[PDB]
A = this chain, B = another copy of it.
Amino acid sequence: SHSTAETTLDSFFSRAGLVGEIDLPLEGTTNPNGYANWDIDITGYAQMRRKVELFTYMRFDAEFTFVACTPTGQVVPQLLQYMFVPPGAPKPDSRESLAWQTATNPSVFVKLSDPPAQVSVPFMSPASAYQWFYDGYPTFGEHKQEKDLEYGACPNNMMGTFSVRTVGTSKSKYPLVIRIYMRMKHVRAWIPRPMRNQNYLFKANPNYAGNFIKPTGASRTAITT
């Protein structure tokens, strides 16, 4: 090459896109308790996991901002403050849990009229870095023949969740619409692996079906031009 100033790596990775969507129904049947918990599950969606699966060894912090509005784009003066529970502590199950009274958990409160919120959280996972693949048995216990009582629900791998409540004596009477954007701050990778070509059947397993697919069949016949 001759000049590599315009070819800067800055544009090679930085792309903001919609990743999550959280709804707050005022009544419902799926969530009739009026509160929901959303763990950070990158593997939940296929379209984002395709970019991430090219990477094997990574550790980084996160930055999120929250916006709420109406389907017509009108703005309303509502204030929220967000509280985070470390992943080590178990997540609340019922409203009468002690997680809402914990004062030892740090919190940061910002308004909406101010410039957009910029918050960062450190890497608190006890491991060194996240591992997307594991050629073995995920449990790190001395027992290698039985299974844990909490099989299926293993929050020991994720990074926790957030709790949302409304300020006021009575419950809020407006549902909100919120969209979330995700990004990486540092990019460092070691072992390059191929991505996926066919579609996914299950959310947590890459298994396939008996109807095989082909990358392309554009050429009617190879014998002719």
Contact = CB atoms under 8 A, between A and B. Distances in A.
Interface size range on A against B:
35 or more
Interface stretch (A10-18, A139-147, A201-209): A10-18
A167 B78 contact: no
Contacts of A19: 103
B73 A78 contact: yes
A94 interface: no
A182 B83 CA distance: 14
A212 to B, nearest CB: 24
Contacts of A112: 75, 111
A180 to B, nearest CB: 10
Given A166-B72, A174-B72, A115 B116 contact: no
B116 A167 contact: no
A80 B70 contact: no
Nearest to A180: B103
Interface in A177-214: 177, 179, 181-182
Given A11-B122, A114-B115, A72 B107 contact: no
Interface of A: 11, 14-19, 47-48, 51, 65, 67-81, 83, 100-116, 122, 165-177, 179, 181-182
9 contacts: A14-B106, A15-B103, A16-B107, A51-B104, A70-B167, A70-B168, A71-B166, A71-B172, A76-B77
